[PDB]
A paper describes a structure:
[name] is one of the most abundant proteins in eukaryotic cells and plays essential roles in various cellular activities, including locomotion, division, and transcription control. The dynamic assembly of [name] is controlled by the hydrolysis of ATP, bound to the center of the molecule. Upon polymerization, [name] undergoes a conformational change from the monomeric G-form to the fibrous F-form, which is associated with the flipping of the side chain of [name] toward ATP. Here, we report the crystal structures of the three mutant actins bound to AMPPNP or ADP-Pi determined at a resolution of 1.35–1.55 Å, which are stabilized in the F-form conformation with the aid of the fragmin F1 domain.
In the crystal structure of [name]_AMPPNP, the two water molecules replacing the side-chain atoms of Gln137, WOε1, and WNε2, had a continuous electron density and were separated by only 2.5 Å (indicated by an arrow in Figure 7D). We focus on changes in the local interactions and water network of the active site due to the loss of side chains (A108G, P109A) and discuss the various conformations of [name] observed in the F-form actins.
Residue numbers in the entry:
A (entry chain A): 5 to 41, 51 to 375
B (entry chain B): 7 to 160
């Protein structure tokens, strides 16, 4: 009996088998249908995006199209991993502070539609902390949909101090699409969104000092980079490289009044008991694709230093594999018989229904 | 948001502690642990918690991860037991070993009713408390270690 670990990100499915060191299937969490008004999933939808309109069933960590999400799960089991789900206990993931109904319906579909023998829904940031070999620390997890901060002490997340911002990679992609119009470029369609997402991933970075960097960008072309579009045209981008992820520190760039990711991290630590704050400040763990911008750890270090007491020892841990830290933590925990002992069995679901997820999954 | 409407509404509850206490009953390594003053040591070996024989206590493979339970009499009562639980991470331990050592440290803490105080001990960064566990010259680092439990995806 081999458990499946399926990290359903807002943007990417990461799926594979417990005990493996990496997910064996990683593909876009998208369903595509003809742009001219029957569907394609994942890599193939991306491949045919020239004729398709692409839709993400998960927005900001919440499943908003359950029919399409069923297609995503079906595709993961039968077309990618090529497994029979009724043979595999399955570990799923979720952002914290999601509405309770999201995991209730996840539980219903896994048992009633896919007939899994057992399942568990884990909080993503907790899995990343264990992947880093820690029981105490504060995780900053940022994917395509959610940025969340989870302080954890001696293996228990502190719910009163968990913070969440519905601002992450997809918002940054959309913002890059917008600001590229200032150069005369027009990226508007769902297919064009995927092109700009690639530009963002390849060329963006976090400036250590934003205003200084803006001045550098105007002084000469030293920061400019070229990028070849699928149709062969070559575009040039400059200060957009760092203005795009600056939004994480200045959410007003997209009209949000929220605190930036440095302030939210500080605020989360400050919600915890004073005697554990030094341990949290020394163990900030980054996880998720939106934490991959070059320069982000250094900028976090600088900004948290400015907010914290002047003698506070601060460390940002940025694992190189952090696009997969949640998945890897799930692979480790799902390899442990005691962790699997807490999973919901099909019989428990038959007798108790979806509500049982809240009594078993923490 | 509204925590009570959310998927973290039951974090921090007695129910959470009860479920995790039950899970810790399914690990053979904890049976009889922490029953008397002394040091008990296990090594992670392909995801399993494996006892280290007492003759080896204080010697640690640099490629491996370990759990060290130190049982002692607290100042408050010379006839009762208190606990420090240290997880020791070798400089060359692999991610599966360190992650299992962390998770299973929490589990042993659960098994002992939350009483243990946890200490993460990376090789070369060991706490003053950890250095005090072993007699003069008792702390020794050994080359090598046991193979990772991970299967490598090419
Ligand atoms: N090198 C990078 N720089 C900036 N953003 C990145 C990078 N790599 C991936 N991303 C972004 O991270 C997100 C996907 O990361 P992931 O952690 O898999 O998210 P999710 O779990 O929400 O699917 C997307 O927004 C993607 O564009
Ligand atoms: Ca080893
Ligand atoms: Ca404890
Ligand atoms: Mg994610």
């Amino acid at each position: 009996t081999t458990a499946l670990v399926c990290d359903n990100g807002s943007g990417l499915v990461k799926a594979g088998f417990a005990g493996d060191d990496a997910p064996r299937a990683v593909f876009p969490s998208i369903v595509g249908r003809p742009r001219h008004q029957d569907s394609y999933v994942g890599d193939e939808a991306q491949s045919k995006r020239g004729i398709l309109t692409l839709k993400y069933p998960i927005e900001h960590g919440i499943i908003t199209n359950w029919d399409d999400m069923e297609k995503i799960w079906h595709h993961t089991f039968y077309n990618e991993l090529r497994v029979a789900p009724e043979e595999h206990p399955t570990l799923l993931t979720e952002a914290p502070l999601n509405p309770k109904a999201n995991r209730e319906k996840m539980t219903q579909i896994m048992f009633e539609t896919f007939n899994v023998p057992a399942m568990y829904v884990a909080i993503a940031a907790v899995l990343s902390l264990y992947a880093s070999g820690r029981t105490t620390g504060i995780v900053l997890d940022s994917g395509d949909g959610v940025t969340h901060n989870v302080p954890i002490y001696e293996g228990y997340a502190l719910p009163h101090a968990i913070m969440r911002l519905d601002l992450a990679g997809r918002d940054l992609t959309d913002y890059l699409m917008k600001i590229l119009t200032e150069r005369g470029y027009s990226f508007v369609t769902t297919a064009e969104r995927e092109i700009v997402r690639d530009i963002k991933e390849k060329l963006c970075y976090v400036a250590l000092d934003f205003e200084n960097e803006m001045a550098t960008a105007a002084s000469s072309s030293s920061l400019e980079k070229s990028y070849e579009l699928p149709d062969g045209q070559v575009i040039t981008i400059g200060n957009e490289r760092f203005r795009c992820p600056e939004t994480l520190f200045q959410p007003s760039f997209i009209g949000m009044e929220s605190a930036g990711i440095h302030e939210t991290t500080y605020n989360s630590i400050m919600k915890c008991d004073i005697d554990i704050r030094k341990d949290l400040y020394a163990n900030n763990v980054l996880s998720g694709g939106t934490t991959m911008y070059p320069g982000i750890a250094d900028r976090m270090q600088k900004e948290i230093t400015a907010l914290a007491p002047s003698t506070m020892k601060i460390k940002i841990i940025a694992p190189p594999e952090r696009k997969y830290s949640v998945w890897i933590g799930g692979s480790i925990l799902a390899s442990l018989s005691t962790f699997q002992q807490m999973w919901i069995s099909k019989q428990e679901y038959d007798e108790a229904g979806p509500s049982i997820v809240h009594r078993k999954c923490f | 948001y509204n925590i009570a409407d959310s998927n973290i509404a039951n974090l921090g509850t007695e129910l959470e502690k009860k479920v995790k206490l039950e899970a810790s009953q399914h690990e053979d390594a904890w049976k009889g642990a922490g029953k008397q003053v002394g040091v008990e040591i296990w090594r992670i070996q392909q995801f399993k918690v494996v006892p280290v024989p007492k003759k080896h206590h204080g010697s640690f493979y640099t490629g491996d991860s370990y759990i060290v339970l130190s049982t002692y009499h607290p100042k408050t009562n010379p006839d009762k037991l208190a606990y420090d639980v240290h997880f020791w991470l070798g400089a060359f331990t692999t991610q599966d070993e360190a992650g299992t050592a962390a998770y299973k440290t929490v589990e042993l803490d659960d098994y002992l009713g939350g009483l243990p105080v946890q200490y993460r001990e990376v090789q070369g960064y060991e706490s003053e408390r950890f250095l005090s566990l072993f007699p003069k010259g008792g702390l020794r680092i050994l080359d090598g270690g046991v193979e990772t439990g991970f299967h490598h995806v090419e």
